[model samples]
Target chain A: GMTEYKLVVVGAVGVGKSALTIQLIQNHFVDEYDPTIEDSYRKQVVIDGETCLLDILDTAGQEEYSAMRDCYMRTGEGFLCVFAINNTKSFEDIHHYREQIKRVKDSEDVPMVLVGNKSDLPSRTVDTKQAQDLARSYGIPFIETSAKTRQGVDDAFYTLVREIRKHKEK
Target chain B: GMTEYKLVVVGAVGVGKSALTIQLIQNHFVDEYDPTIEDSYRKQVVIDGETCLLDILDTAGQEEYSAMRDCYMRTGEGFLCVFAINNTKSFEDIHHYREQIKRVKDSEDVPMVLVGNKSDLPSRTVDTKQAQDLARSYGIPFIETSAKTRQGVDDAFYTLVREIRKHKEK
Candidate 1:
């Protein structure tokens, strides 16, 4: 039987949340900003030689779409809390999103990963240590990513899937 | 002979460069932002049970004062490359300041510490792991501080002094 995992990407505005999702699904990056794009993406890939389906929900990191956040959080088996390396506010805003996810899911230990996007940029506001500490506090993995350059794109999603597996077994 | 160490604090605007310096010298925090304030501060402190005189240069992290940066960088025996945990640009800007310090000092192995300030704030943009990784790359120590709360303030300055001692001995 092919396993299916529901994943959510949440973060602040312009943190390249969609770019990461699009990159993993389509193997390309989206440079433009489109708030009204598709909310869900599906792709089948083999992880550790086992075929699995990934149903990713790329939620809007905007204040306007926040009302719908609970719905997505409730259904997501795992999450990718993303922030841009060059955007400080995006990094600061990650805590709120993570807190909301835990509240909606009603679980103290949720499957998640802290993702720092825009790694290719010369300007980075958030230090890697800061992100790693936050991830450590949450007891989750941290991965730096560049959706434009396709760096750590697959690893971010794949790691979340692996998190879900470990979570379920426990 | 009592050892005297010259240290410089360098970073982007509003990263609390002066706050850390003042916290060490005055034993209090300055909530106001005064760009035209004193640039030099001196204090006598005991580090590792040895009393030493610390001559600290609190340089402006502004573009207007950039022309004077090289002079300070050249004279300083050690440096504290600071960034605000809540400011992404400040964190990203650390690289340039560090590179400039190295260039002015004309040495790859300068005594320095990567500092992430404003730790008391609920909002944080820079991660501890990110800063640690960069510090590791530079072969320097990394410290997260809060000038307002005096968290890790003394440790940061003391650590730099130790770095200078180690460098001098080598």
Candidate 2:
């Protein structure tokens, strides 16, 4: 009877955000929710023998403020801030995503994890310590993963799950 | 930005009843606080994308006094009847579980669910059809959940939450 934990993945375009989530649930990550709007996925999984209903928005990086605001209101317990390590330009934009989530949930205590994806590529730009600094400032976990290689992808989601469970326990 | 909902856990003695409430909140279960005593846990949660605070009374499974039952009636908007599937006696005893809620609430209908807990065990004695039929007759959601494996636990709580919402909407 653990709470039904919900999580969302947010990042910029071309950052391979959906790839990370798609790797976890595979086909459960739906690329289409509306006939015209962006892609979203809803699936159920169990972690630590607890049934968890995960609803991943797999949200597009750039969004209309109104739609983004609504997503913040609707997004559930946890947030995954994803950016490509090869794109340092996407790093600063993650601050905007974190701000919206904090404002909507009205709590800085929201469970979130920062991930630098596309580590398998050679065009790396964002540093691990840079992501870790932002995450540490927000009191969250930060990790580097390559969805293409599935490197540290499991650790990323597992860390987010642990953080959400910790928040729920509190 | 949060509504408050209260639910009571009830059933015959030794039905592994408290595990459901304990697992939901994660840290509210106290094993040695006096077996004859009652405890309560209050926390915030979201139901159907609506933020709500759930006040769960880690209530005693057995009640010898009708006044205590009335207190429960006054305290909660919903009830969960937790019975172990491995114990057929607890299954037959759910009539008492239903009757008390109806009597105390003074209504033919109330938000409640029949929970067959401990589904991970192999000593199953109760018939699933029997439980489903009883729940159908009462017009409640019947779910078999394992606090051990956490199967159907999310649905059990969500069903009760939806039923409470249904009552409120009515």
Candidate 2 per-residue C-alpha lDDT over A1-170 given as tens digits, one digit per residue, 9 for 90 to 100: 22344567777777777777788768333334332234445557777776655555566535465644453443456788888888887898889888878887678888899988888888878877888899899999998888887888778877888898788657
Docking class of 2: incorrect
TM-score on alpha carbons, each prediction: 0.49, 0.51
- Enumerate the candidates' DockQ scores in order: 0.01, 0.03
TM-score of 2: 0.51
lDDT for position B97 in model 1: 83
lDDT of 1 by residue, B54-93 (tens): 9898876454345355546655779999899889888788
In lDDT terms, which candidate is top? 1
Judge candidate 2 at residue B141 and give its lDDT.
86
lDDT, candidate 1, A56-162, per-residue tens: 87876455455346545655679999999999988888889888888876678889999999999998778999999999999999999999999999989999999
**By TM-score, who's the top model here?**
2
Which regions of candidate 1 fall more than 4 Å away from where they truly are?
A36-38, A64-67, B1-170
